[PDB]
Amino acid sequence: MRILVVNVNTTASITETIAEQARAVASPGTEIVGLTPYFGAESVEGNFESYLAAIAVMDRVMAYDQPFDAVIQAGYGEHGREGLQELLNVPVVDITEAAASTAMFLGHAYSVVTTLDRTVPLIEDRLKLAGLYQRCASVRASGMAVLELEEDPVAAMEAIVRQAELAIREDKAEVICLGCGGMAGLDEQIRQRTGVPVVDGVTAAVTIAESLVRLGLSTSKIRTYATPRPKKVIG
Amino acid sequence: MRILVVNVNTTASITETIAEQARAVASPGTEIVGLTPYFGAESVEGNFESYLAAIAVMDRVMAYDQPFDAVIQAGYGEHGREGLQELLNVPVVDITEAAASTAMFLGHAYSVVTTLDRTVPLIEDRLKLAGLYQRCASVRASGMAVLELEEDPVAAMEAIVRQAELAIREDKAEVICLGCGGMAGLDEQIRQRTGVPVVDGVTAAVTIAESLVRLGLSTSKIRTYATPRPKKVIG
Amino acid sequence: MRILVVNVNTTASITETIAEQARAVASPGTEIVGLTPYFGAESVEGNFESYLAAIAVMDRVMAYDQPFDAVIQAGYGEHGREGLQELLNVPVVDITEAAASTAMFLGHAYSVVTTLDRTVPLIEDRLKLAGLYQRCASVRASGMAVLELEEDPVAAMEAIVRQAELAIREDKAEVICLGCGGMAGLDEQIRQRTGVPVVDGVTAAVTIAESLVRLGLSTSKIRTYATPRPKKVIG
Amino acid sequence: MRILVVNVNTTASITETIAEQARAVASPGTEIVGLTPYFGAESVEGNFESYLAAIAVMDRVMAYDQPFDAVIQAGYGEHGREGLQELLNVPVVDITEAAASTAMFLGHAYSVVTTLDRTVPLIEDRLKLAGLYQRCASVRASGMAVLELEEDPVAAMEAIVRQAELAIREDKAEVICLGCGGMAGLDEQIRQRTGVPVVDGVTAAVTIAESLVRLGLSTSKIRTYATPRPKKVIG
Amino acid sequence: MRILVVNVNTTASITETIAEQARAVASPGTEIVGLTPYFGAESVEGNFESYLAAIAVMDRVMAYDQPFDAVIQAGYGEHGREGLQELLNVPVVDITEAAASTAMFLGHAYSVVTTLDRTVPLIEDRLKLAGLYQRCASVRASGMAVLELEEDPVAAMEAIVRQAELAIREDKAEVICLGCGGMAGLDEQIRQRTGVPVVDGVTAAVTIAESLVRLGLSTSKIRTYATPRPKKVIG
Amino acid sequence: MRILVVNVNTTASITETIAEQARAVASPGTEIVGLTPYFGAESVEGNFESYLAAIAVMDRVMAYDQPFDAVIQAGYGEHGREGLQELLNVPVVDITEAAASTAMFLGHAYSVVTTLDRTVPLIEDRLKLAGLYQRCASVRASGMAVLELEEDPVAAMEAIVRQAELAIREDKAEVICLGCGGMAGLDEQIRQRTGVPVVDGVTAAVTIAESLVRLGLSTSKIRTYATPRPKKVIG
């Protein structure tokens, strides 16, 4: 099968890293295609940039010419999932929901550790909408400005594990979810350091996407995600 | 003062109808500037068109070069308010939240009457995010396509009252919220035909916008709606 | 138009101060009438005094002989709103709900800062009933015994801003709501000190009351707030 | 021990009916003292009369000059419990909460059957405040005016069973709570006619009052129900 | 009447202590029978042991040969209540729910103080299911390994009151509920030390059980707790 | 890898049907080992049999002496998952949560169709505990007794589609979850007859089990599902 894995931000280096991580868990016969949107912010930080990224991602998927069997939106706490669901006749998985949903099988309560404080309420709102928030102990920001993870990977790792530890100790999280795709593959280190399973939405999304295809499942087109009624649309 | 009233769809005649109902209640000294987005669907029906309209609305507002005091987004149940709240340092009122918020001063419970069944869950989700759904007895669809409103208003009118009556008698609604911009000015007739206050989010949003301006209040910039960090963003 | 603004407590000096603040935002042609109930506690502190104030206020409004177009209950976290709504055929706004409701347009979450700790659960319960509590980050008590604000206005101001800062820093409030009418007009100082919009329910209620009259809206009499069935009542 | 059983309305014959059902289940050694408030509506139907009854009940209790061990407020869905809890240092039981609380020991879900449609939302709100609504499948109105109960009991009886059956079959109620004091003693006939346990809040409140006394338990005075601070209060 | 009081754990010394405490509040003519299950853990600590105790307790009750009028499950936060309810044609009260339910008449919010941290989410889940959790301020663990209360009753008492004080001061609990039956009778000391009523589920359950029998109430057999359909069951 | 698929009831033919549907979707390299508990009801209908099945399932798993990588509990709405999660250091998937969790990727809301009305509230409660009920539009019973499924499948089939249609049209379900193990493989026919994706928790649980294994993830042992403390436990 073919799975499109779309970055929500325009940074080509992040697309390839995410895609690589998707390729490391993909099943035999699964082809992962990483896609960079044509427009949008280099890192998606806030409501404005999130809504720009929602249509950036859908523009990017609707440009792809080859057949494909699933789409993964590779961004934590951003908009657009639902619009993809309407546009496409294949399953869509967003990594936010892939992480929280897989975490819920593992523990009484899960926490998410993201980058910026200002992205906490967007991630919270995404999960509440998904109906996944009941078992979320908290969504916590490490505080590192997105691009520093390649500059100081040590200061980053430390800031992240400090939040993981507060979530386990104060919020009673039993599993940690990564909260920017740019965190893919750092999960073993966080596990080594906390003694809890640590879910990476990128890899979790691949398995859920692969599963829905194996099960013959796709978005319901009955109501909310009906194909859009063809009409006059500009631009 | 100057208030931008922005249509979520690209049909310019609907923009004039909305801006004229707005002017019909604006305080002396208030200028209404009705804006039609430059791109997007001619009527916004579903998630894909809602997200496109979100960004189409923001683009239209950011292109306006005069000063203004508040903005009103004149669509029911669409995405975008939060985007605008980050970009602007004037208050933003969404007619969805304007209607429900005012209705709650008037009755134990309110119901919204929209056009299409498929917009019902988009509306519920906006209300839920806003923390305004506890007092909503239901969102009901009249079944009338957005544009069939100036076509056959007498049938539109009857379809709306039909649903309003069902909300009152079965849902225990005590107040009715109109749920398309295209319904602006219809409240008086529905009030007469139902026996309950009928709230027009267009005219309610005007009063709320004017209030927030008179009161010296604007969007909090402390966290969630802080100005977007300056950064690279294509297009 | 005419708007009655009723103190919930019997202190004549508080009625006049509230009314003055209402007069400073009222629109041209709006007449504000401040009313002191004939009975009740000099400051309303707790369930017993709140229920006494509920009927004190309704007794006070039903005594007023002149026509009027709206009523404001000028008390934070007290009972009685609903009984006014049944008694009257004009809109009723309580300042508790005017503050929370206006705050919700301004920020992701709002907090209320009141005087006594023991009034926190009454205000919480009022907002939960109003269906306004979802976006309330916390209700916090400054701790100053009600009447000290005229004695030590500095110690008061300080205690208040300390709670505002805890709400923003720990509870993630993005807007502050004042929580005793006796706090009217202190909002600029709190804003100066926190960098967030600060809503005063007194002035916010005036605009909402004025709006409902301009929009031709009044309480729904369909069910819950039906006129009371005339019957034998004593005293 | 001595338990005050206080009618919420001023009809003395209803006070005797309630106090006699109470006596029918009181433990040996328990004295029931049935009280009729001095002012208020002859039947309490709506918010205005509910708030008046709240204060009318408290006045009546504070006028009683003998000692007593507990108080029961014998009205369904009325205001006042909290007022009494502040003023008294003996336990207070409201028959509303007494019924629902006991019903929850007996079935997965309960429903209340009251008289008037307009009291339905007052009842729901009391249950919600009490934290007892999660297990309530519904509150249904029999449509019988409060006093039409000793007038035509055979029609009252049938109206109640009608609603009870609807709650069981459509709402999935497994237990029925009578929802006027005027229905005391009817449970046996409804049980027979419905097939489910039927709870009488009057008699349940007696057992709970007696329990709290036997157990040495009374209202917590630490915070919300602390004695009212001594202060000036007119009338 | 006869009331069975069943230990959830297999420790004979705990059964007799619980039963003694039940006998100290029982009404005249009430016979308390303490029962020890034939199998299960010596102290019930966790999901596995709780589910073993659920069927241990039902096995123990179904072995008892004499008539009886009620059953009390004498364990805090364990499973099985519902299965008893199906099996029996008499009322069942679990002490978890007896404590929380009686506490709710006493104060704005209640807290539970139990032994082990790992039992906190089971007790939380039990109360959420019971629909009693809305008014629960927190469930807190003292941390003492179950059997130390007979070894160091002083270190135990201290650990317990420390949690009670955190619940009142930080969680705003107004009443404390004991949270292992092995705590029966320690409530006066905790009351002496905190100034709040302290509910013991053992004694509270006796009064609720006695009440349901006096009121002629028993489990509803209409749906969820219908007698199990006789069929082939092994072992 | 090896995955234990455990029937909740003792009917061995139902164990083979479940294990064969599981094998029909298992990845190459995956071994399915279908287990029939040693004691318990021949079909699990209600709380008593649910609790017995919980412990019967755990006993069966603990008796298995080979190594394995994950366990699946193949019953809808039964107790036990948490028990297994404490005892095991391999992931555990319950088909109840497997179905609902996967369904949520596919539609705005899902509904479950089970057999017996009396299992409906057991199912709702499992979903609620799991934090998966927010997106559940309803749980409906087909009315078909568990074993009447291989007896008359054409009538079973029609009973299920009947309920599915009612969930879609009245409950606004967009996806259907089969709610007995005995329904495994029926999804294709129901999909055809309803027009919406149909999820089989048996086959979904397999994909999720395999995913968690591929991802290196297992049950968190930090708190709620820590191994049971070693201690005395009879039988």
Q: What is the 3-state secondary structure (H, E, C) of chain C?
A: CEEEEEECCCCHHHHHHHHHHHHHHCCCCCEEEEECCCCEECCCCCHHHHHHHHHHHHHHHHHCCCCCCEEEEECCCCCCHHHHHHHCCCCEEEHHHHHHHHHHCCCCCEEEEECCHHHHHHHHHHHHHCCCCCCEEEEEECCCCHHHHCCCHHHHHHHHHHHHHHHHHHHCCCEEEECCHHHCCCHHHHHHHHCCCEECHHHHHHHHHHHHHHHCCCCCCCCCCCCCCCCCEEC
Question: Sign of torsion, CA A132 A138 A144 A150?
Answer: negative
**Orientation angle between helical segments C95-104 and C201-215, nearest 10 degrees:** 90
- What resolution (Å)? 2.2
For residues E110 and E177, the answer to whether their CB atoms sit within 8 Å is yes
The whole-angstrom separation of Cα E45 and Cα B40 is 60
The whole-angstrom separation of Cα D60 and Cα D35 is 7
10 Å Cβ neighbour count for D235? 10
DSSP codes joined into one string, E35-66? E--SSEESS--SHHHHHHHHHHHHHHHHH--S
Secondary structure element (H or E) that encloses residue F166, with its range:
helix F153-166
Residue of A nearest to B127 (CA): A129
Question: Sign of torsion, CA A97 A101 A102 A104?
Answer: positive
Interchain CB distance below 8 Å, C42 and D228:
no
Measured between beta carbons, which residues in chain E are less than 8 angstroms from residue D101? 101, 104-105
What would the two tokens of residue B80 be?
């975008």
Q: Which amino acid is at E43?
A: S
Measured between beta carbons, which residues in chain F are less than 8 angstroms from residue B121? 108-109, 172
Angle (nearest 5°) at CA F83 between F81 and F84: 65
The whole-angstrom separation of Cα E57 and Cα E153 is 28
For residues B69 and B3, the answer to whether their CB atoms sit within 8 Å is yes
Angle (nearest 5°) at CA B170 between B169 and B171: 105
The whole-angstrom separation of Cα C65 and Cα C58 is 13
Q: Which of C49, C51, C88 to mutate to test the interface with D (most CBs of D within 10 A)?
A: C51
**F73: closest CA among F34, F128, F39, F104?**
F34
For residues E49 and E41, the answer to whether their CB atoms sit within 8 Å is yes
Residue of F nearest to D107 (CA): F121
CA distances from A189 to A96, A156, F223 (A): 20, 12, 20
For C19-25, which contacts have Cβ atoms below 8 Å and span 24 or more sequence positions? C21/C184, C21/C185, C21/C200, C21/C202, C21/C203, C22/C72, C22/C202, C22/C203, C22/C205, C22/C206, C24/C203, C25/B214, C25/B215, C25/C203, C25/C206, C25/C207
The whole-angstrom separation of Cα F6 and Cα F87 is 15
For residue A42, give every residue at least 6 positions away whose Cβ sits within 8 Å of its Cβ, in sequence order, or none.
A9, A10, A11, B231, B232, B233, B234
The whole-angstrom separation of Cα D91 and Cα D220 is 9
β partners of residue E37:
none
What would the two tokens of residue A66 be?
């080859």
Residue of C nearest to D131 (CA): C125
**B8: closest CA among B180, B199, B210?**
B180
Alpha-helical runs (H) found in B28-184: 47-63, 81-87, 95-103, 120-129, 148-151, 153-166
Quick one: CA torsion of F92, F97, F103, F105, rounded to 10 degrees?
-60
Question: Sign of torsion, CA C152 C158 C163 C168?
Answer: positive
For residues E46 and E118, the answer to whether their CB atoms sit within 8 Å is yes
For residue B57, give every residue at least 6 positions away whose Cβ sits within 8 Å of its Cβ, in sequence order, or none.
B6, B8, B37, B73, B80, B84
For residue A170, give every residue at least 6 positions away whose Cβ sits within 8 Å of its Cβ, in sequence order, or none.
none
What would the two tokens of residue B30 be?
């208030």
Q: What are phi and psi of C223, to 5 degrees?
A: -150, -90
Interchain CB distance below 8 Å, D220 and E175:
yes
Supply the DSSP symbol for D147.
Answer: T
- Smallest Cβ–Cβ distance between D222 and the set E131, E195, E212 belongs to E195
Residue of A nearest to F137 (CA): A131
Supply the DSSP symbol for A170.
Answer: I
The whole-angstrom separation of Cα A210 and Cα A90 is 11
The whole-angstrom separation of Cα C77 and Cα B107 is 19
E87 burial level (CB within 10 Å; 0-12, 13-18, 19+)? buried
The whole-angstrom separation of Cα C144 and Cα C114 is 9
**A231: closest CA among B19, B46, B57?**
B46
Per DSSP, the three-state class of A199 is strand
β partners of residue D110:
D136, D175
Measured between beta carbons, which residues in chain E are less than 8 angstroms from residue D203? 215
Angle (nearest 5°) at CA C151 between C148 and C156: 55
Residue of A nearest to B45 (CA): A228
Per DSSP, the three-state class of A33 is strand
Measured between beta carbons, which residues in chain B are less than 8 angstroms from residue A117? 223
The CA distance from F50 to the nearest CA of chain D, in Å, is 16
Strands (E), D36-108: 40-41, 70-74, 92-94
Per DSSP, the three-state class of A32 is strand
10 Å Cβ neighbour count for E24? 13
Place of tokens 């309580």: C94
Place of tokens 């992701």: C108
Secondary structure element (H or E) that encloses residue A235, with its range:
none
Angle (nearest 5°) at CA F180 between F174 and F186: 65
Q: What are phi and psi of E168, to 5 degrees?
A: -65, -45
The whole-angstrom separation of Cα D39 and Cα D52 is 8
Secondary structure element (H or E) that encloses residue D218, with its range:
none
The whole-angstrom separation of Cα D219 and Cα D222 is 9
Place of tokens 């992205």: A119
Angle (nearest 5°) at CA D157 between D155 and D159: 70
The yes-or-no reply on D/E contact (3 CB pairs or more, < 8 Å) is yes
Interchain CB distance below 8 Å, D25 and E214:
yes
| Cα D136–chain centre separation | 16
For residue C55, give every residue at least 6 positions away whose Cβ sits within 8 Å of its Cβ, in sequence order, or none.
C80, C83, D51, D52, D55
What would the two tokens of residue F71 be?
């366990």
Q: Do strands B233-234 and A40-41 pair parallel, antiparallel, or not at all (unpaired)?
A: antiparallel
Q: Which chains does F contact via 3+ CB–CB distances below 8 A?
A: A, B, D, E
The whole-angstrom separation of Cα F201 and Cα E24 is 51
Measured between beta carbons, which residues in chain F are less than 8 angstroms from residue A212? 102, 105-106
Angle (nearest 5°) at CA F59 between F58 and F64: 100
For residue C41, give every residue at least 6 positions away whose Cβ sits within 8 Å of its Cβ, in sequence order, or none.
C9, C10, C49, C52, C53, D231, D232, D233, D234
The CA distance from B100 to the nearest CA of chain C, in Å, is 11
- Smallest Cβ–Cβ distance between A131 and the set F104, F208, F220 belongs to F104
The CA distance from A121 to the nearest CA of chain F, in Å, is 19
Q: Which of F51, F92, F234 to mutate to test the interface with E (most CBs of E within 10 A)?
A: F51
Q: How many helices (H) and strands (E) does chain F have?
A: 9, 10
What would the two tokens of residue C215 be?
């929009």
For residues E73 and E179, the answer to whether their CB atoms sit within 8 Å is no
**D50: closest CA among D126, D106, D133, D113?**
D126
What would the two tokens of residue B50 be?
């809602």
What would the two tokens of residue D136 be?
């309530």
Q: What are phi and psi of E15, to 5 degrees?
A: -55, -45
The yes-or-no reply on E/F contact (3 CB pairs or more, < 8 Å) is yes
Supply the DSSP symbol for D119.
Answer: G
Place of tokens 């978890």: E96
The whole-angstrom separation of Cα E131 and Cα D104 is 8
Place of tokens 């201690």: F231
What would the two tokens of residue A220 be?
């319901």
For residues D39 and D56, the answer to whether their CB atoms sit within 8 Å is yes
- Smallest Cβ–Cβ distance between E79 and the set F40, F79, F85 belongs to F79
Q: Which amino acid is at C216?
A: G
Q: Which amino acid is at A188?
A: E
The whole-angstrom separation of Cα D177 and Cα D201 is 7
Q: Which amino acid is at F83?
A: G
For residue C111, give every residue at least 6 positions away whose Cβ sits within 8 Å of its Cβ, in sequence order, or none.
C136, C137, C138, C139, C140, C164, C167, C168, C171, C173, C175, C176, C177
Supply the DSSP symbol for B182.
Answer: G
**E186: closest CA among E144, E137, E127?**
E144
- Smallest Cβ–Cβ distance between E46 and the set F38, F46, F228 belongs to F228
The whole-angstrom separation of Cα A79 and Cα B51 is 8
- Smallest Cβ–Cβ distance between E217 and the set D197, D215, D217 belongs to D197
Interchain CB distance below 8 Å, A102 and F215:
yes
Q: What are phi and psi of F75, to 5 degrees?
A: -145, 150
What would the two tokens of residue C87 be?
């008694």
The CA distance from C67 to the nearest CA of chain D, in Å, is 21
For residues B196 and A12, the answer to whether their CB atoms sit within 8 Å is no
**D128: closest CA among E129, B201, B57, C125?**
C125
Supply the DSSP symbol for B75.
Answer: -
Supply the DSSP symbol for D228.
Answer: P
Architecture in CATH of C1-235: 3-Layer(aba) Sandwich (3.40)
Instruction: Please list, residue by residue across F29-39, b when 16 or more beta carbons sit within 10 angstroms of its beta carbon and e when fewer do.
Output: ebebebbbbee
Measured between beta carbons, which residues in chain C are less than 8 angstroms from residue B200? 215
- Smallest Cβ–Cβ distance between B46 and the set A43, A86, A118 belongs to A86
The yes-or-no reply on B/E contact (3 CB pairs or more, < 8 Å) is no
Q: How many residues does chain F have?
A: 235
The whole-angstrom separation of Cα A32 and Cα A3 is 5
Q: Per CB distance under 8 Å, which residues of D are interface residues toward C?
A: 10, 38-43, 45-52, 54-56, 58, 79-80, 82-83, 85-87, 117-118, 121-122, 125, 128-129, 223-226, 228-229, 231-235
The whole-angstrom separation of Cα B160 and Cα B162 is 5
The yes-or-no reply on D/A contact (3 CB pairs or more, < 8 Å) is no
**E79: closest CA among E27, E119, E108, E139?**
E119
What would the two tokens of residue E163 be?
């949690």
Interchain CB distance below 8 Å, A197 and F218:
yes
Alpha-carbon Rg for chain A in angstroms: 17
Domains of chain A: which residue ranges? 1-235
Secondary structure element (H or E) that encloses residue D183, with its range:
none
Strands (E), F27-132: 31-35, 40-41, 70-74, 92-94, 110-114
DSSP codes joined into one string, F53-79? HHHHHHHHHHH--S--SEEEEE-SS-S
Interchain CB distance below 8 Å, E39 and F234:
yes
The whole-angstrom separation of Cα A226 and Cα F21 is 30
Method of determination? X-ray
Instruction: Please list, residue by residue across A77-108, b when 16 or more beta carbons sit within 10 angstroms of its beta carbon and e when fewer do.
Output: bbbbbbbbbbbbebbbbbbbbbbbbbbbbbbb
Per DSSP, the three-state class of D233 is strand
β partners of residue F4:
F33, F71
F202 burial level (CB within 10 Å; 0-12, 13-18, 19+)? buried
10 Å Cβ neighbour count for C195? 10
The whole-angstrom separation of Cα A147 and Cα F110 is 39
Q: Per CB distance under 8 Å, which residues of D are interface residues toward F?
A: 108-109, 172
Q: Which of F71, F208, F220, F221 to mutate to test the interface with A (most CBs of A within 10 A)?
A: F220
Q: Per CB distance under 8 Å, which residues of C are interface residues toward B?
A: 25, 27, 91-93, 97, 101-102, 104-108, 130-135, 168, 172, 174-175, 195-197, 199, 203-204, 207-208, 210-212, 214-220, 222-225
For residue A40, give every residue at least 6 positions away whose Cβ sits within 8 Å of its Cβ, in sequence order, or none.
A8, A9, A10, A49, A52, A53, A56, B233, B234, B235
Q: Which chains does C contact via 3+ CB–CB distances below 8 A?
A: B, D
